Amino acid sequence: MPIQVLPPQLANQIAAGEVVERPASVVKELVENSLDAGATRIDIDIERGGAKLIRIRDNGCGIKKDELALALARHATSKIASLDDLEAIISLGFRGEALASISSVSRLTLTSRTAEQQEAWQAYAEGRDMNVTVKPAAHPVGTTLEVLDLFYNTPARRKFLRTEKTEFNHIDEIIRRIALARFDVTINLSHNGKIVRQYRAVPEGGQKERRLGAICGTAFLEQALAIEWQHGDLTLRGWVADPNHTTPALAEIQYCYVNGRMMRDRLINHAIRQACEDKLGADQQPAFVLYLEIDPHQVDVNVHPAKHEVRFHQSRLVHDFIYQGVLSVLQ
Amino acid sequence: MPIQVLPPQLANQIAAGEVVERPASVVKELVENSLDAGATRIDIDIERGGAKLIRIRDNGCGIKKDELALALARHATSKIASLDDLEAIISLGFRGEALASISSVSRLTLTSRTAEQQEAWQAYAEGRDMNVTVKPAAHPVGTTLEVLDLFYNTPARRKFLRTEKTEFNHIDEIIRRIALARFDVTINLSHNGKIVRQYRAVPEGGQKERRLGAICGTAFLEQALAIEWQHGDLTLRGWVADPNHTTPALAEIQYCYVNGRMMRDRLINHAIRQACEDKLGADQQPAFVLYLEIDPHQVDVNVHPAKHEVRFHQSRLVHDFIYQGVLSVLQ
DNA sequence: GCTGGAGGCTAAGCTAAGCTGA
DNA sequence: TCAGCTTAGCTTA
Ligand SMILES: Nc1ncnc2c1ncn2[C@@H]1O[C@H](COP(=O)(O)OP(=O)(O)NP(=O)(O)O)[C@@H](O)[C@H]1O
Ligand SMILES: Nc1ncnc2c1ncn2[C@@H]1O[C@H](COP(=O)(O)OP(=O)(O)NP(=O)(O)O)[C@@H](O)[C@H]1O
Ligand SMILES: [Mg+2]
Ligand SMILES: [Mg+2]
Numbered sequence: 001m002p003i004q005v006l007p008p009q010l011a012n013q014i015a016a017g018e019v020v021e022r023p024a025s026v027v028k029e030l031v032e033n034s035l036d037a038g039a040t041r042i043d044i045d046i047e048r049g050g051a052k053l054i055r056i057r058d059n060g061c062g063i064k065k066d067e068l069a070l071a072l073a074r075h076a077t078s079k080i081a082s083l084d085d086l087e088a089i090i091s092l093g094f095r096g097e098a099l100a101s102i103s104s105v106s107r108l109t110l111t112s113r114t115a116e117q118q119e120a121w122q123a124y125a126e127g128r129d130m131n132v133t134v135k136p137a138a139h140p141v142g143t144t145l146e147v148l149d150l151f152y153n154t155p156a157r158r159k160f161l162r163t164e165k166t167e168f169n170h171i172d173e174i175i176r177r178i179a180l181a182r183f184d185v186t187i188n189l190s191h192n193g194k195i196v197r198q199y200r201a202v203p204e205g206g207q208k209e210r211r212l213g214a215i216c217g218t219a220f221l222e223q224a225l226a227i228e229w230q231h232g233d234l235t236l237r238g239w240v241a242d243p244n245h246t247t248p249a250l251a252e253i254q255y256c257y258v259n260g261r262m263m264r265d266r267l268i269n270h271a272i273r274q275a276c277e278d279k280l281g282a283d284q285q286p287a288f289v290l291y292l293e294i295d296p297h298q299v300d301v302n303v304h305p306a307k308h309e310v311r312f313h314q315s316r317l318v319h320d321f322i323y324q325g326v327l328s329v330l331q
Numbered sequence: 332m333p334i335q336v337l338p339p340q341l342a343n344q345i346a347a348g349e350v351v352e353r354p355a356s357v358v359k360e361l362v363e364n365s366l367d368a369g370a371t372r373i374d375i376d377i378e379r380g381g382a383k384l385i386r387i388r389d390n391g392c393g394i395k396k397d398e399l400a401l402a403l404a405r406h407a408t409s410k411i412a413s414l415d416d417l418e419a420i421i422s423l424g425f426r427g428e429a430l431a432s433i434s435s436v437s438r439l440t441l442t443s444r445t446a447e448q449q450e451a452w453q454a455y456a457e458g459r460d461m462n463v464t465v466k467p468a469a470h471p472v473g474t475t476l477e478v479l480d481l482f483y484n485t486p487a488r489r490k491f492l493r494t495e496k497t498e499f500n501h502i503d504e505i506i507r508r509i510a511l512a513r514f515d516v517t518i519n520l521s522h523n524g525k526i527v528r529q530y531r532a533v534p535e536g537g538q539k540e541r542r543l544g545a546i547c548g549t550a551f552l553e554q555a556l557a558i559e560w561q562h563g564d565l566t567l568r569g570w571v572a573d574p575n576h577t578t579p580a581l582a583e584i585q586y587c588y589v590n591g592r593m594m595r596d597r598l599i600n601h602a603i604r605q606a607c608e609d610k611l612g613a614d615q616q617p618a619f620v621l622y623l624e625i626d627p628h629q630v631d632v633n634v635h636p637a638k639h640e641v642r643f644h645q646s647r648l649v650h651d652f653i654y655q656g657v658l659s660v661l662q
Numbered sequence: 663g664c665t666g667g668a669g670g671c672t673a674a675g676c677t678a679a680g681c682t683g684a
Numbered sequence: 685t686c687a688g689c690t691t692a693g694c695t696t697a
Contacts, residue, residue: 018633067334156417156631159644162673270667302348319668597669603669648697651697
C-alpha cells in the first residue's frame, strides 16, 4: 500500500474528528468566529437537537465575496500571518480547520455581506476536492451559517449522536459559557423555532448582576462574592459562590476563562480544588466564574484542537496566584 | 486583514503545537510509526534531554524513494484510503500531520532502505514552502529518523522545555508504556551514548513476567495479580497491583491500553478511580497495567491529535464493565 | 537536596413542579 | 380553580 496524499474532503473529515465532537462544538466554533468579527447580536436557531439544522446569524464585519471561497478553505485565516502573530494572539481563531471541518462533515451554506459591499453572497463546498461555488443572495451587514444534516456523509459519527434533548443541553451549556465570557454581545437561542434563552447585552460600564443571574441562576447571584486580585500582570476577577450552604443544583456552574477563552484546564481546576479543600476540608467544590488576565506572551493557547486547555510559561507562579486569589475569596 | 492561505511551514508549525508537546511526544510519534511499520528492533538515542538530538532506528519495511518524498509531506499516509478504513483501524496512524509537524519544528533527516531496493536514501524537508531534498546514504533494511535542535525556529515553545533531566524522564515514561503495550519488540534506550533501558522481546507464548519487572520493578511482580475478566465482546486483561502494601514508588505505574494504544482517557481512569475508592480507604489508587480489548467499531480513536483519549459508542456499558472488572480484581 | 506538575464518566427515562387553558 | 402538558432534576446504566 503506497504513501498517498488523502483527498481534501477526507483530510477535513479527519480534522472534523477532533474539532467537531458534537453539534455543541459546531455551535461553539461558529459563535467564536462571529465574536472575533466584532458582532453584537448573535441569533442561534437549533432544530432537532442540532442533527437537522444549526443556523447562526450575526451583525459582524462579514466576509467580502472574493475572500468567501478562501474562508471555507482549509489552513486559510485572517487572524495570523506568521509565528510571531501566533505568539501574541487576541482572537479566538488561529488555524483554518474550523469552517473546513464543519463544511466537510455537513451541508454548510455561508451567506455574508460586508458593510462596504451592497449585495450578499452564498458559498457552499461540495465534491471529493471540496470546490466552492458562490451564488448571489439577500442578507443585511453580517453573516449567516446553516449546518444542515450534521454527519450525513460520515455514518459512524451519526451513530455517536445521542437523543435530541441531550444534544440541545450541550449546545445550551456552550451558549451559557460564551455569554458569561462576553457580557457585551446579545445571544438569542431558539430550539425548533420556540425561543429558549435570551441574554440582553449590558453596555460597557453597566451592572453585571442581571445577565449573570439569567445564566447562572438567582441562588448563585444572591450567593456570589465578586473579587479583584492583582500580583502584577496576573489579574483574577469574577464571582465565586459560598461553600457554607452550596446546593448540588449550584454545583454544575464551574467555569474559568483565561483572556476571554473557555478553559477546561487541569492546572487551574486543580488550583481551585486545592484552595477549596484547604479552607473547607472536604470536596464541596463550590460554584465559581473566574476571569484571569495575563500577557499573551506568558501563555501558549495553541495546545488543543478545540482550544479548551492551555500551557502557561510560568506554571508554578500562575498556580500560586490562582490559589492565593481563591484563598482570599474564602475569607 | 485579508483571508490568506497560511504558508506550509506555518501550517505545520501550528499542527506541531498540538501533536509535538515535548521531546517525549516526538519519541512517541516516531516509535509508533516504527511499530506499525513492523519492527522488532527499535534503537532510540536521546542526547541533551532531546533538545540536541533524538535518533530512532528500526528493522521495518522501509520507504522507497518516491514514497520517502511523500512521507515528509502533510496529509500523506499509507494507513487509510477512505472513511471505511478509518472505521476499521488496526494501525497506529490516521493522518499525515506527525512527520510534517516534527520536520516543521526541527531538522528532520529521514533515512530508509526497503528489503527489495538496492541502496538507502536520506530525505529532509526545509524552507518556508517545505520542499523535500532526497540525497543517497547508507543504512541496513529499516529506517532512521534524527530530530536535531528541537524547536530551534520556534522560540515561543523552547521556553517551555523544563530541563535536561525532566525531558528524558518523560521520554523514558513513554518508552516504558510502549514496551508494555507490545511485549513483541526489543526497545533499547540510550541517553548521551550510555545505555539506560534494554527490554528483550519475549517470543509468542513466552513468559511476560521478566520484562514486566524490567519496566515496573520486582515489587510490582511480587504484588502482581493477572486478570482475564470477559463479559460479551469486552475483555479486560493485564496485571493490577495489590493496594494492601502499595508504595508511592509503585503509584507512578497507572497505564491502561484500548486495542493496544496508550490511553490517558477520562472515562477509564474515572472508572478505576471509583472502583479503587469503593473497596479501599484513604484513596489508595493502586498500580495497574490493564489491556482492554473491544470491537474496533464500538470505539472511536480519532478524537485527540496525540491519540490518547477514545470516544466509546457504549460509554455507560464500558464504564460499568471496567468498574466490575477492577472490583472483581480487588478481592 | 532540589524541582516539576497536577489523576478525576455521561445519557436516557421517569417523576415532580409550574404555567396555561377550559 | 383544577387538570394537562412541558421542562428540569434525579437515578441508574
Ligand atoms: N461571522 C463571521 N464574520 C466575519 N468573518 C468571519 C466570520 N466567520 C468567519 N470569518 C472569517 O473567515 C475566516 C474563516 O476561517 P476559520 O477556519 O473560521 O478561521 P479561525 O477562526 O481562525 N479557525 P480556528 O483557529 O479553528 O478558530 C476567519 O479567519 C474569519 O476571519
Ligand atoms: N519507521 C517507518 N518505517 C516505515 N514507514 C514509515 C516509518 N515512519 C513513517 N513511515 C511511513 O510514512 C508515512 C508518514 O506517517 P506520518 O506522517 O507519521 O503519519 P501516520 O503515522 O501515518 N499517522 P499519525 O498517527 O497522525 O501520525 C506513514 O504512513 C508510513 O507509511
Ligand atoms: Mg474558526
Ligand atoms: Mg505517525
